[PDB]
């Protein structure tokens, strides 16, 4: 009966998912390699791992004490509530006694808390009262089992890179720059081959180029070996896999995935809506997504231009520190003449705005969207599934079950990398290390602490990156929410951040919004015709697509010599989104590729496990980023 | 290990689901109970089963053979590809031996089926060359089985009413008085002591108004019994626990679930949106839902008013015969001059844009838009579950999960249904007994073929509400595309349908939108604090809510003397969504509350095999639409 | 063999347990439902909770912080001993961060607690040092399993009354009438057509008479809707369950339970005793126990009359405060002339009486003795049972088995219910609804806090019962000991209580009393001839019963028409120890028959678990209290 059959399909996809080879968990061993000295004795210093929230030293910047990070991992490793809760928080004074337990600062009596914080921001920051402090999210996130989808600990991503290595000079490199390209028009991100360019209608202090950054990413080097110029055999199979080519104008910020080279840097599904339902009112250019009866606006909320957060030590150690500054950033005003609440809300002109869309970004919303625009379009699934072709012929005939599958797959994926983030790599942000070169620069450390940085901060400055960067940062310092800072007129090296909390609560290796990324696409490709050629139109022979305005009033139109593809956009999107993390200065490259080869892995395991419960015993082709496509 | 007890986990949620009570399926036995006269013989008539797409007689408009439903069936409960394959479709002609399957009028080779519609519309649907035969949609995904919620089969919806019965008389009048209201100003669906009630813009001829609809329903009675009137002793059960109280001002329309009958009739989260990001542009009057950095438009595209379909037996008939005609309604084009593509979209004035919003509504976007208005507000999370209160105190801080599972859902409650509707209960739709009714009244049929609709009939011509249909009918017909049809000047009884396709291919008994509502709903109420209050805000003491204005151009403010609770609004969303389809045509009231409370089971039981993911061991507060809360 | 087969009955009786159906347990859904106000925002005002321990608010008397709450309930969830020790206990001061857990004013620091409590009682409790601070009871009970009965989870008991349905407001005022009647003589609460009716020796201040009482119930009604009055129709299928017929005479504060009715109020088994062993020097109504060799006085410690306590806010705060109280009422001291230590100790003669019986009662005393008592009567056991009637035919002839049953019973029942109480229902004390009565007519609370208590006042101040109790209360007052606190002539409307300390620490919904007394008694019928008619004698042709004297000296004998059975007084007994409660004013009706009908299934369920031990196969008879009886 159907009732023995029901508890055994579901035992059966158990024992799929408990038979699929268990990997093992390895890391940089950074975390209690580089160490510092203490009173008659060395130890781990712990700069190359995720400290955000823990005591910083107020007037150094470093971790203030070990023994607080050493508690922090026992409550992840021992996944106890109670032991957790024992982890000091915040700004805190050190002990008398040697090895003990930090002090915090802060409490529950503390209505007012302004005393506690040294930037003037987090000082006036909850209405004149003080900031107050967050806590890390998600940390026992990782230890949860699912129904369906492999286990957490059941796939493991490979390890991160190191400070001394060629690879993460050049992924630091790359992110520093996008933090002063985080101004540029989205027309720039491309081959001027393909169409006229266009430059930011709001004129900005700009202290990088892209001309210069693409001589940056080539020029700069460890030990006289860059990233892009290592040939296979001095690299690891793993480095190999993830290895990119020589930076061009067109590849650029741009992920290693089919179809994100070819066409603009801006997917389409994140510009472009569905014709107007019915009697066609408007076209596909007006950015209305076919959300069925109602409609979706593309337009996202414009962040002031020019406006940088964590430029300064004062500011950027507050936020190390805990200081919770979420929405402090300003927004531009809307133009009461002009309709669609605009310049308020705007088309995705610059980095910027990607980076404000990922900074409240819905899970699937990216996914779900591009879903909704394909089934609006009329895009066909890829032909193996049933009930398809003529309703006459086959008397039979879906999107209700891919609709929930995008959504289904977003879950599973954050309590995969979750485990990666914390239980795993446990890796520093990049605005973390942002930190570390200002601490070199500064002389600050005890003894041979950021030796380990030495290394880094010199190919930096003999590309001469960090002379803009300090340049660049004196100018955002001249505002007067941080003027009052006393390190304004000290040369701060720090990455300038887009969040004035910047990254969030969790460590950087492992990317929630690249992991649920490549497992929501991989999902979408599986039900779609990848290859669908879309039908956006044709102008003079030559395909068309689309890209914004200088003001983001409509889209400009580009002209290709072949069509875009349903999975080389949904390749782009899946990388926007991960890469937008990145212009906001809180992801590394690698963070993005590693954490999507990963997602797809999650959403391929459902798909298999999910397959026991139809009886028609069809195949799905997945097409995969790493070249050829996976029958399921 | 985890590999162990991931495997575990999983295969104790198997058997928990297989360990819940399996109930038996039975329906009102209708289906082989009323007979028409064969040669030298009795045969079921099937005139109380759905039978749209197979084969209508074109003079009668009665099922043209029996043998053609036998095959139909045997396909569904034998669950073969090629049984279902050999089922008739369409128009047909009789086999000259008695018992044999008809012969299907179209095939591949028609390019043009003009021929073979007797319809105008029809004719003339496919630019020209004839409307296409559409086919039954997911009949084999009631025999689908799920890794998470219980199967299909371990949970039933008590049987549908019948003909004979005073409470279908009740229904089918009430879904009639619908059609006739459709074109009514929401604000007249409520107690006029609330605040000042609107007229439509559009002056359109009513041959029904509320008062004389609020009369009809407590004065419609089969054998002298009224549906309301009747006492708890007479009726069963089953019958006892839907029953409703006499009708009011207040509550006509409204489904019986806590907190509908509270407030105007539309719920908030249909109308309203979230506070424009960062600095408050616009207020939640607006109607732009905070999707993340985007926003979702709450206007839905406005159908041209006074436009019904399927008025005249020809148009009817053709649609029961499987004619494809989806997208043939027009809508109102956009007035130059408006900002936001007003008129051509607006917020929901009349029921007609309640019909438009669930024709195309995607599955969720209705429990998913309440999900995000909720999130947007800063709605608290029912406290029972972790990481909630202060960041300082408890040192952990989720809205991914709850936004996932209102998807995860929705799947699970098709799969349900799509067993009740085919399998088990196999009911008619509103217009296919829409078409009984006036089949009976022109005395068609073979001997005593319609004699079960004859006490029917009465009932509603002895309140008076076949005499407005026809006339509403009458000025219908007067229309260009369907005025050439024989039977324009026929008295058509026939019920006025909002899509021209009206209902879609599958049977009535169990609402695939009502399933999807109860499900979804249940979830968001299971995590949020059900009770939250909304602050939407204070006027002269009293709370303010909101309803449309009669151009439907902004929101006019309603004072109510208690708050709006979140519980409230769920339900309200969760019935107007499935009586949104009772005003389109397609469904009776009883099919939106017992899929609804069938619905609610398949969500439960999802969170009890979830439950067993969680080390926590926490527990979450569920309220049920019969009245207390489950622990879970 | 015999290592083989025990070790299987054992496994058998697990696995019968297992397959008998598990119950989902569902509530009034109050306790997130009612709300107040809170700085831009409405939390769960948790009024219709229990919160006795928690930090109440010293001026206002309502729950001084929702997140003390939040965190009780967390430990109880969670089921995590440190947890439960984070939650605040007895007075607080509120934190000066919003949202963070309430400063406990009192620790192990304090060895004098004076300064803490408002009430004169408690200052001066602990002999001048001031009362100590009581935790809550077996709030880990419900989370242990036992080797034979059915499991705490695989048992409900369906949910509560509201404070807004007519039903409670019946209870309420029960219990609050109970109070008034407390001094009243046991005579009276009983049809005078039986015998010569007496008053209580010691003349008391009444403010409410029998004649009146009855009348307040038929009366006092919500929506012109009366408790007893409504018709089943109105009521749901759990009200239809428990309701109950007009209040008379006779049945007034009297169990719904075959044979309670019947005879007078007070059972004979709490008063009556065993012949004196061997040659009789005394009969029955000398209330001698034959409890072997030695005996059981059945004369109770009496109270001292017309002495109430919690009567003002001082005094009630405190005990809802967590004061521990215990042993702090005076007891009347013993008369040198007569014999048997009275009146120091005298037959149960008033409610106070039997409140003061239940106050020490061990768990099984009441159900123990009643088997002494039917043990030394020579009662027959249902003839089903093995080695009956003669020695000399069978050659076979337990006592032994009976007696450990019924104390087997009791433990398996705290702990059904210790779950309910908590984990589900987590219902207020009566007394703690006693305290809201007063606070809405102080006008205290936050805005509409206690709007949803004001429909029940209206009701109890409609019929005149507010009236009585607030002049009640004001001659306890003018007693030295609560005369010197503030609210003294405040016109408090508290119900009065028994006990200093009033209800236990733990909440109302489950009676640990009522449960016992259920499965104790169900045993008792099983094994006992159910129907054995008692021959206490026969008067006049009238079979004879007992009921106290005016003085309580003797057992003053009534005349009944028909003799009283087995059943009927084992049915009466489980009544009064369970409505004995409902006298004290610590239970509801409700509480009474709910956890009585759970009583019986873990009883039931015990039984049929240890059934597979016996070869003999045999069947044992249980009248149930719904009507007939089960075989086993």
Chains 1, 2, 3 share one sequence.
Request: glycine share 10%; proline share 6%.
């Amino acid at each position: 009966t159907r009732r023995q059959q029901a508890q055994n399909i579901r035992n059966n996809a158990a024992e799929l998912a408990a038979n699929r080879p268990h990997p093992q968990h390895i890391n940089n061993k950074e975390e209690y390699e580089y160490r510092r000295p203490k009173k008659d004795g060395n130890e781990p210093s712990h700069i190359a791992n995720f400290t955000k929230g823990l005591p910083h030293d107020e007037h150094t910047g470093l971790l203030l004490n070990s023994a607080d990070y050493d508690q922090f991992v026992l409550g992840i490793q021992s996944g106890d509530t109670t032991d957790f809760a024992r982890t000091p928080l915040g700004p805190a004074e050190l002990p008398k006694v040697h090895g003990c337990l930090s002090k915090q600062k802060i409490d529950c009596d503390d209505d007012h808390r302004s005393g506690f914080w040294k930037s003037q921001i987090a000082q006036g920051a909850a209405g004149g009262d003080g900031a107050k402090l967050r806590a890390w999210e998600s940390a026992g996130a990782g230890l949860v089992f699912d129904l369906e989808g492999p286990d957490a600990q059941a796939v493991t991503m490979p390890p991160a890179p190191r400070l001394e290595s060629p690879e993460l000079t050049s992924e630091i490199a790359e992110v520093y720059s996008q933090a002063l390209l985080r101004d540029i028009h989205f027309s720039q991100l491309r081959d001027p081959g393909l169409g006229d360019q266009v430059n930011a209608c709001d004129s900005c202090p700009t202290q990088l180029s892209i001309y210069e950054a693409i001589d940056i990413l080539n020029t700069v080097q460890i030990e006289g070996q860059n990233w892009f110029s290592a040939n296979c055999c001095d690299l690891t199979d793993d480095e190999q896999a993830r290895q990119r080519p020589l930076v061009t104008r067109q590849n650029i910020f741009r992920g290693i995935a089919p179809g994100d080279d070819v066409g603009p840097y801006l997917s389409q599904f994140l510009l472009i809506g569905n014709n107007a339902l019915g009697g066609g009112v408007f076209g596909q250019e007006a950015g209305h997504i076919g959300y069925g009866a109602i409609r979706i606006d593309q337009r996202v909320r414009k962040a002031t231009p020019c406006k940088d957060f964590m430029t300064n030590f004062e500011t950027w150690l507050d936020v190390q520190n805990g200081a919770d500054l979420r929405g402090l950033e300003t927004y531009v005003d809307a133009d009461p003449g002009k309709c669609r609440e605009f310049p308020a809300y705007r088309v995705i002109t610059t980095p910027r705005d990607l980076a404000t869309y990922v900074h409240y970004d819905a899970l699937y919303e990216a996914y779900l969207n591009a879903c909704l625009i394909l089934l609006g379009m009329g895009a066909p699934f890829d032909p193996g599934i049933p009930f398809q072709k003529p309703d006459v012929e086959d008397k039979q005939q879906g999107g209700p079950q891919i609709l929930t599958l995008v959504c289904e797959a977003a879950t599973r994926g954050l309590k995969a990398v979750d485990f990666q983030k914390f239980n795993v790599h446990r890796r520093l942000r990049p605005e973390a290390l942002g930190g570390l070169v200002d601490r070199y620069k500064h002389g600050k450390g005890a003894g041979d602490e950021l030796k380990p940085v030495a290394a880094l901060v010199e190919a930096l400055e003999n590309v001469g990156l960090l002379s803009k960067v300090v340049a660049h940062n004196q100018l955002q310092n001249q505002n007067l929410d941080r003027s009052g800072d006393p390190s304004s007129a000290g040369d701060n090296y720090f990455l300038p951040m887009a969040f004035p909390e910047g990254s969030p609560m969790h460590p950087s290796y492992g990317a929630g919004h690249a992991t649920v990324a490549g497992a929501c696409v991989t999902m979408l490709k599986a039900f779609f015709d990848h290859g669908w050629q879309l039908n956006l139109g044709m102008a003079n022979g030559k395909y068309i697509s689309y890209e914004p305005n200088q003001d983001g009033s409509s889209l400009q139109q580009v002209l290709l010599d072949c069509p875009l593809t349903v999975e080389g956009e949904l390749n782009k999107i899946a990388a926007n989104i991960s890469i937008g993390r990145d212009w906001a200065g809180v992801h590394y490259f690698t963070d993005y590729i590693e954490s999507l080869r990963l997602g797809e892995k999650i959403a391929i395991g459902i798909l298999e496990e999910q397959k026991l419960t139809y009886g028609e015993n069809f195949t799905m082709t997945v097409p995969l980023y790493d070249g050829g496509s996976i029958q399921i």
